[PDB]
Design a binder for this molecule. Structure first.
Ligand SMILES: [Ca+2]
Ligand SMILES: [Ca+2]
Ligand SMILES: [Ca+2]
Ligand SMILES: [Ca+2]
Length: 394
């Protein structure tokens, strides 16, 4: 009951953390190559706790000479679910994805090829620190909903890396672009002749992959053929040591939605179901920071699916769900901690916790504060240190 207001305030601080990071797939025109480039960061949960980050840089250039659509800057937003087929004995992965374009606030000939369900084949040959492997995958895509359903088999036996590290490499032409962004869909404009997709992926504190793929129609089927080379991986790191989680629970208790609704209400001060730049600004000032109008617009734009310039309740819930599913880096948890630890000493005092509360919404004269400190205070000093904070928040 005072643990309830940690959750509330914790979620709010986590929401502001989210709105200040860059989590989507960022796309920009590359006129020199008549294509596009992208960059983004992927988070892979480490089974025993922590996150393995994978930084991606990407380049796409058309295989043919027809004109292609070169986009304004925007992003793709991906939801992925990995599972296992219980009748499959081979090393494998079942993958369901939804991908939508956004990032531009309120139609090519190649888009015609994607109006129904299109079969897909994927073939990958890889070599990571000398361990070679192959993967084949098959399924279908339905661009109308930005949807993909595929099964992948390692045809060479055991995969020497974790399956989740290969998801990005294993057909963005299946993304759903909304009506007002059709002119930014490079991927389908290149079809049917297709495009070359190249990446380098840096796994932090570890090795990297370098990939080259050809994505084109062969007959009625959209085919993605890839080579991958990985080097400099550590034999006891998260990749070659198989320490990454396969299965993230797409949980969402009704309890969790209710707790997100509670944090949503700190931002949504007029109770209209949507967070405006004025509301988000109010909250951020009240926490000390002092952002311009432009920054507030960019923050909202990072999670604003419909492009209306506001974060509505369901867009907030989606954002909070992804933020809880994927582990934060140590730097990010430290930033959250700093919002409470105003003086920087490494310890949240009854006083510091009050300031943050007063300033954020809650009325709470000294008594309920004390109970909050006590609830989180493992070592008994009457203060909350980092490690106690980290435990409070899981
Ligand atoms: Ca509002
Ligand atoms: Ca919106
Ligand atoms: Ca302090
Ligand atoms: Ca303590």
């Amino acid at each position: 009951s005072s643990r309830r207001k940690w959750n509330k305030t914790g979620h709010a601080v986590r929401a502001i953390g989210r709105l200040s990071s860059l989590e989507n797939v960022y796309i920009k025109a590359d006129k020199q190559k008549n294509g596009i480039k992208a960059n983004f960061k992927i988070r892979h949960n480490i089974e025993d706790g922590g996150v393995q980050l994978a930084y991606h840089y990407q380049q796409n250039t058309p295989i043919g000479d027809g004109p292609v659509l070169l986009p304004d800057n925007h992003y793709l937003s991906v939801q992925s679910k990995l599972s296992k087929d219980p009748n499959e004995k081979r090393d494998h992965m079942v993958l369901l994805e939804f991908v939508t374009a956004a990032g531009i606030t309120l139609v090519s000939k190649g888009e015609e090829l994607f109006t129904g369900v299109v079969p897909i084949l994927v073939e990958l040959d890889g070599d990571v620190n000398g361990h070679k492997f192959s993967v084949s995958g098959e399924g279908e895509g339905d661009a109308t909903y930005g949807k993909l359903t595929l099964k992948f088999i390692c045809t060479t036996g055991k995969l020497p890396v974790p399956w989740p590290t290969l998801v990005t490499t294993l057909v963005q032409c299946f993304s759903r672009y909304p009506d007002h962004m059709k002119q930014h869909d490079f991927f389908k404009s290149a079809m049917p002749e297709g495009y070359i997709q190249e990446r380098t992926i840096f796994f932090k504190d570890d090795g990297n992959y370098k990939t080259r793929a050809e994505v084109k129609f062969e007959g009625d089927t959209l085919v993605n053929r890839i080579e991958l080379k990985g080097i400099d991986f550590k034999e006891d790191g998260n990749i070659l040591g198989h320490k990454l989680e396969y299965n993230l629970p797409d949980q969402l208790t009704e309890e969790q939605i209710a707790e997100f609704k509670e944090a949503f209400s700190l931002f949504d001060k007029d109770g209209d179901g949507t967070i405006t730049t004025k509301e988000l600004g109010t909250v951020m000032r009240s926490l000390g920071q002092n952002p311009t109008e432009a920054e507030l617009q960019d923050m909202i734009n990072e999670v604003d699916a419909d492009g209306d310039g506001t974060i509505d309740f369901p867009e907030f819930l989606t954002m909070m769900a992804r933020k809880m599913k994927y582990t934060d880096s140590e730097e990010e948890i430290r930033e959250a901690f700093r919002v409470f630890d105003k003086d920087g000493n490494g310890y949240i005092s009854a006083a510091e916790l009050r300031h943050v509360m007063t300033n954020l919404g809650e009325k709470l004269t000294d008594e309920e504060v004390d109970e909050m400190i006590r609830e989180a205070d493992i070592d008994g000093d009457g203060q909350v240190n980092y490690e106690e904070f980290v435990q409070m928040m899981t």
